[PDB]
Amino acid sequence: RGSHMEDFVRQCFNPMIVELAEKAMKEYGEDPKIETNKFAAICTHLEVCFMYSDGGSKHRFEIIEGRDRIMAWTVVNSICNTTGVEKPKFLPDLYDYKENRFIEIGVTRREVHIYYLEKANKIKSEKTHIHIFSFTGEEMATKADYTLDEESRARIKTRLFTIRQEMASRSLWDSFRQSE
Amino acid sequence: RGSHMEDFVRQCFNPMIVELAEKAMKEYGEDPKIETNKFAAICTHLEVCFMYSDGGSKHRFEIIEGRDRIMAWTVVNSICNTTGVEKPKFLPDLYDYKENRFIEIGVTRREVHIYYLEKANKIKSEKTHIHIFSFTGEEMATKADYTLDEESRARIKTRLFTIRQEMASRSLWDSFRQSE
Amino acid sequence: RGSHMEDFVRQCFNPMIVELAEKAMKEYGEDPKIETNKFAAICTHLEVCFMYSDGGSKHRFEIIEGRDRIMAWTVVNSICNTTGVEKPKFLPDLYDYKENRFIEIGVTRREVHIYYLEKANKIKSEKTHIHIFSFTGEEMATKADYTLDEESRARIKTRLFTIRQEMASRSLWDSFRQSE
Amino acid sequence: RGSHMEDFVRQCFNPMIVELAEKAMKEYGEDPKIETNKFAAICTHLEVCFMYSDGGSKHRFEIIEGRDRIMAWTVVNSICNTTGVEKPKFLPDLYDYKENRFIEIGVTRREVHIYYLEKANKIKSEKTHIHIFSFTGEEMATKADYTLDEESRARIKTRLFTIRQEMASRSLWDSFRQSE
Amino acid sequence: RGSHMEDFVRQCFNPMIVELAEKAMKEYGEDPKIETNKFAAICTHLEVCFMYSDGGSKHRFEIIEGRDRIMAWTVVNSICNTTGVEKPKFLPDLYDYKENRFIEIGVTRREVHIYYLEKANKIKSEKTHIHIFSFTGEEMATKADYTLDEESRARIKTRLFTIRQEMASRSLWDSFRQSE
Amino acid sequence: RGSHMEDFVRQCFNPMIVELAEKAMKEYGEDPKIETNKFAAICTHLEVCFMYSDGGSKHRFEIIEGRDRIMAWTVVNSICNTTGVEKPKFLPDLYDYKENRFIEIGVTRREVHIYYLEKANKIKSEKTHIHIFSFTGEEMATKADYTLDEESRARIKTRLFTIRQEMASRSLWDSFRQSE
Amino acid sequence: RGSHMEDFVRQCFNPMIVELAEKAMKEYGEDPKIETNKFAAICTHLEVCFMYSDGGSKHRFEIIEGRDRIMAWTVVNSICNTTGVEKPKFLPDLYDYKENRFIEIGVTRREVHIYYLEKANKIKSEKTHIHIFSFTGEEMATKADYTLDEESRARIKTRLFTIRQEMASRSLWDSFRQSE
Amino acid sequence: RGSHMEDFVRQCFNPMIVELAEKAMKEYGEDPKIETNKFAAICTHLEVCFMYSDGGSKHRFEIIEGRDRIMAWTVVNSICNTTGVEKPKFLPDLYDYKENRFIEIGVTRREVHIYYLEKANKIKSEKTHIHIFSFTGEEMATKADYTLDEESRARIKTRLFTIRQEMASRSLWDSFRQSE
């Protein structure tokens, strides 16, 4: 399956992020060589989660996304059993040691408005914080609490718009947008 | 001596921490292949001491634990002979340059209450600060002065509860708990 | 699933071999955390294939085992389309540039006699060379042509018997033997 | 073309900075082996841009200089399309996430006065911030807003005067000064 | 210029080979982003030259291809001025210290027959040895002297056919073949 | 010249510090194999200078000690020609970009009182700041301005007393003390 | 215990060899800080064993010396159980895959004559090969079969005489010689 | 002393060879910044000695050149005291374990004829082998025994002629030739 999207994903994202998105997709019964648009989505969501944890302090964030299903749930139990936050129903992306809450990071191709509502209806735990990023440069967080400073968030938006530009340069953006 | 506990310890802790706990046990006439529960304890105590010094400033802590007996006592003399703190009777774990005191780090499987009293009766030097961590997520420090920020301490509790979970997953926690 | 076998496999084989055996099992719908005996078999077979290619000359062997299914078949086509050997029905392990033939490497827990016959009935291509190794130290190759020198083969047998010893030391050999 | 200036440039600046200045010159139809004085200028301007971004915070600056023409313009579009700053007519050197503006870094051999006016007449976008450095130790920024702290700027002036000293020691400064 | 061929070239060949082919093309006034088929050809020819020198002894071959124009001609002069071979009119790829002759390596998409004749008419120096490789697996050398052993040459043919397969998988082979 | 002191110096200080002290001594016509006590002094003074610059900010200090005579004077000229401080008569150890002054670091075996007076009479430039450290743990700076925080200075005193302890353990301290 | 011999051993032998000799001595109830002459002997014997295995082919030798007691005996069992050689009574140093025999390497300070007889009376297994080296440059092997080529053995003798020279330069050779 | 020759030497030879030639010159009371032609000679002679030892077998040559005066004489004593060759009056460059003799490597700018006679009159030990290389490509060894194979020697001549070309390109060859 010689897909242009797959070759672009492998040259756009670092090898370690590509390997993690490939392990995550294969675990859930998805083929990155065939589900090439979703392949680009898992990498993008992974990178955003990594830059997000790169903002703030060194011991500030515990990274849940990127681990295997069993170990990610193991760290979630340890965080709940030492701090006291309720165990979320769905796997979140990070945990904020500064604010004592889980973070669900979203990357959308539509307006940040519908996606957050979609993620807020899924997350029954009202404690879990939600932060949505768009490929257009718009963002949206729970209670207008954007956690990070403006410049760590600005770096993420700039990166998201560069991925869009490179996709549109290869005529792959249109399929990517009409795929979410 | 093919012990499950030993194989789990070697895959749970980093090689450098394993090598240090092995050198420390052999020096005191203990075999890590036979004293496998204590082997897990020396590694756990070592890691906690390392994360503890990772909190705070770069030049903040002097690490006493993890060295050989003679060199650890050499650094203790140098700290006493330049700052003026009294020479402790027993080897401590760290020295706080910010607060000018030695720190005795404890990791217990019972309630933090009995362990601290056990360590407070041993440490005749009332100057030495005591900080106890539990596998349940509870902590306890001298004069309620927990030295580090809440999040550096939270990371240690989360790690301690993950070690417990992995031990219980392998049916090794019960023997570990009824061993201290 | 806290399995002693899994923890022993991760400490017995190098991380890169473990990662390859995990990718290979997951691709064929197998869980290394549950199929722990087979997990030890894929690692052992992988290592033997790597030591086998380490024998002989630098450009002598092309390693087919250890790649993903599609790329392994891609290299097989390239070898057939430049040398002229017939395309094998099943994926082999190596290709010998010195002798111009594919090699099927076997690692068995029974007598090398039954396993080779089992592999000779499967391999319809009589051109493909077969080389069987046992955990007891016995070996068996097609037409008594053992390809490598005696000492490269001796190193593989010694390694296979060390894996057996470590397994029996942990009381895991009996389950491993009655599992093939 | 055995030029003393070229050999001094290769031993004065790090290899990565030399490689970038060589790629930048060749793209614009310039030969570093013949345009040896300009070769020293591109390296010097590159280093100053790198030390400038080394000042301040980790996520503070986005480095535009040093990339190829197409990618540098790609990051500029992403910054404009997520923050809202106007697209500059000419390629700048950095973007300040803290102050939300592009920075044009200048390194001159004359008085900082004429060079800034020369760069202020070229930059039609009044939003773009201008910061000029001289080989004599003088500096000059837009609205007297020097962005960085005094010591990050002091390190750049010291480096610029060391390059001058090494050039004059090799009797290459006079040609370099009468070349801008 | 979002070209599928360019993204495939960057993921097919190692970064160091890609960087060398990019420097070589830009020097001769060629854009790898636009001349994407030739971009794949320079990388392929470079790799073949590197594997070719990897065959034989350690001090056997002097690599001429891959250097800048001036330095490649400098090494050619040094080889002629110490051994005595005539200075070739055109830049060759290697020099054989074992056989005391220059080697011109060719990689063609047509039959090895026409390409060698094309290269034999260009190379006036009858001393220079010619070795042609095809993407089909055929090879052809001067005086039937193929220099290397069969297996070093076999590895090159296998690699050439894998590049073809990956190109055809992405529907890029047809344009590549009808481009030489 | 098999000196115990030389073998202890090579095992006490890191190789890079040893190499710098050896280059510095040989430049001034001193043999580290014969002047073994001074060899220990140059290493100790070098390390203290390096830990001192490790305190404070990243761009805070410019390290003058440890360079060759000509380059150290080159950086001194650049600092004077961009900030405006007077050119010191003797080579200092550091420059403070935060406080805009040169620092002369001293390590003595007698009382800090006589050494500073000895260094204050030599340094005609009253602008240059003086900071003296002793092997007993006492320190002494110009105008009681100790530049660094207490804990960066405490780390230096602890290290100095450990060097003393290791020297006295090998019966080399007495010769070292009666040598300054 | 500030011993000159210990400081010389740490600067004469590489850190990895020093760490192995320290682990070996501590396991057998010996202190390298007190048994400093034997400390030099374990390092010397270890290095000679490593250079010896460095001679010959890559897969030629299996290194038994340098492992912990249990694992060294594990590899010995695997070699006996795959080749068929009798299990030696005492732990040897190497195994020769080329000649199918164990090797006992000796390093002596007396004449090679008495030491070999001392080692030949201990080794009941007449199959085990014995190879003795002296600090004077003399060697002595079983059946005059010196296994390695003359130059690999010559390198070992040269190294042994350099260790002697450095010891005598520090006036430590006399104690070392009158210690075996 | 801004010398073109010094800047060319630092960019022509690797940093490790430059550092060794600088240590060797300073030991004998020579300044590489002033004796720039000799600086180029020590580097060239060092490199040739290193390529020469790179030819042949791995354990074949013992490198005497490049060490400090005392250690080089220490290895010479060890070689004489284990093999039996007479102690040379002057420090040689290598020792051949294959042929059991010392090698004096020469690099000359005149005809190899006069230089060898100059070196043969100095070397009283007729046992020491002499091998002379010229910048023109001519070589000359004792008893026509050139030790290495033709291609290892050819690589050295090619390198020597490239150094000449780069020197003449910078107009530094004429001074270098009229300096020996």
Ligand SMILES: COc1cc(CCNC(=O)c2[nH]c(-c3c(F)cccc3F)nc(=O)c2O)ccc1O
């Ligand atoms: C079941 O879904 C899949 C999840 C994964 C790994 C990511 N794990 C998440 O939990 C997750 N997934 C998504 C998401 C999605 F919900 C739909 C489409 C694309 C996405 F990236 N957005 C998030 O923010 C987030 O945290 C791999 C394969 C899967 O099929």
Ligand SMILES: COc1cc(CCNC(=O)c2[nH]c(-c3c(F)cccc3F)nc(=O)c2O)ccc1O
């Ligand atoms: C003598 O005891 C031993 C100590 C060590 C190394 C640790 N050195 C300590 O000083 C230390 N030991 C312990 C501790 C304990 F007291 C009992 C059981 C397990 C422990 F980890 N807790 C600490 O907090 C602490 O600082 C190795 C082997 C020993 O037998």
Ligand SMILES: COc1cc(CCNC(=O)c2[nH]c(-c3c(F)cccc3F)nc(=O)c2O)ccc1O
């Ligand atoms: C479908 O089988 C599986 C194969 C693999 C990867 C190995 N690929 C092989 O082709 C292969 N497999 C086996 C083998 C086997 F046939 C049965 C049990 C265990 C084995 F290791 N022996 C070989 O020699 C060999 O080359 C992963 C998971 C699979 O389920």
Ligand SMILES: COc1cc(CCNC(=O)c2[nH]c(-c3c(F)cccc3F)nc(=O)c2O)ccc1O
């Ligand atoms: C077209 O000009 C060239 C630019 C470059 C790369 C640098 N890209 C810039 O945009 C740039 N150039 C300059 C500059 C200049 F304007 C004149 C002379 C020397 C200079 F360094 N100063 C800056 O501050 C700056 O940002 C390479 C080759 C070129 O010919």
Ligand SMILES: COc1cc(CCNC(=O)c2[nH]c(-c3c(F)cccc3F)nc(=O)c2O)ccc1O
């Ligand atoms: C001429 O003196 C020598 C200096 C050096 C390099 C150190 N360069 C200094 O300038 C310096 N020297 C000293 C010092 C001293 F003055 C006497 C004895 C020992 C010392 F370390 N203390 C400092 O604080 C300081 O900065 C190498 C060899 C020399 O003979």
Ligand SMILES: COc1cc(CCNC(=O)c2[nH]c(-c3c(F)cccc3F)nc(=O)c2O)ccc1O
């Ligand atoms: C029990 O002896 C000890 C052995 C070791 C590790 C070495 N293991 C050996 O088996 C060995 N020991 C010796 C040897 C000796 F026999 C006496 C004195 C010094 C020696 F190096 N020579 C060999 O050749 C050899 O192979 C560590 C501490 C020990 O006390």
Ligand SMILES: COc1cc(CCNC(=O)c2[nH]c(-c3c(F)cccc3F)nc(=O)c2O)ccc1O
């Ligand atoms: C005393 O001479 C010096 C030697 C050295 C280090 C090299 N050690 C040698 O022994 C040596 N020197 C020379 C040589 C020479 F004899 C004259 C001029 C240039 C040379 F490279 N050619 C050799 O082949 C050789 O082995 C450094 C500085 C010295 O002044």
Ligand SMILES: [Mn+2]
């Ligand atoms: Mn998620």
Ligand SMILES: [Mn+2]
């Ligand atoms: Mn998410």
Ligand SMILES: [Mn+2]
């Ligand atoms: Mn402790």
Ligand SMILES: [Mn+2]
């Ligand atoms: Mn403790």
Ligand SMILES: [Mn+2]
């Ligand atoms: Mn297979």
Ligand SMILES: [Mn+2]
């Ligand atoms: Mn197989």
Ligand SMILES: [Mn+2]
């Ligand atoms: Mn610019």
Ligand SMILES: [Mn+2]
């Ligand atoms: Mn600029």
Ligand SMILES: [Mn+2]
């Ligand atoms: Mn060609």
